[PDB]
């Protein structure tokens, strides 16, 4: 059952580390890309995607853009982009960590 890539972003939340929560879906599995203030985001140990383990009877995937120690330079606009052959989606939010 093929279907379009989809995304949802939630308000940034502090859970010891900081997390921009997200869910994605799609079949086939989508390509993901983050933007920060409109620039393609290059993940490092200070800002990386972390997924929850997938549930067995599901294609939906959940996770965080995770920031273990954000600073003022991490404040701004975050966009998540998802694509597969049957659709393409984008979501953005503002995050203030300081």
């Amino acid at each position: 059952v093929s279907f379009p890539a989809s995304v949802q972003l939630h308000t940034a939340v502090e859970m010891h580390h900081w997390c921009i929560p997200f869910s994605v879906d799609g079949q086939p599995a989508p390509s993901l890309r983050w933007l920060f203030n409109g620039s393609v985001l290059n993940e490092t140990s200070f800002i990386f995607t972390e997924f929850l383990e997938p549930a067995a009877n599901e294609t939906v995937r959940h996770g965080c853009l995770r920031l273990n120690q954000p600073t003022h330079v991490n404040n701004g606009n975050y966009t998540l982009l998802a694509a597969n052959p049957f659709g393409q989606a984008s979501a953005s939010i503002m995050a203030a960590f300081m």
Partner: peptide
């Protein structure tokens, strides 16, 4: 792309 997942995550790629 992904810092944690150089080979994707269950088919999801960066």
């Amino acid at each position: 792309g992904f810092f944690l997942y150089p080979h994707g995550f269950y088919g999801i790629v960066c």
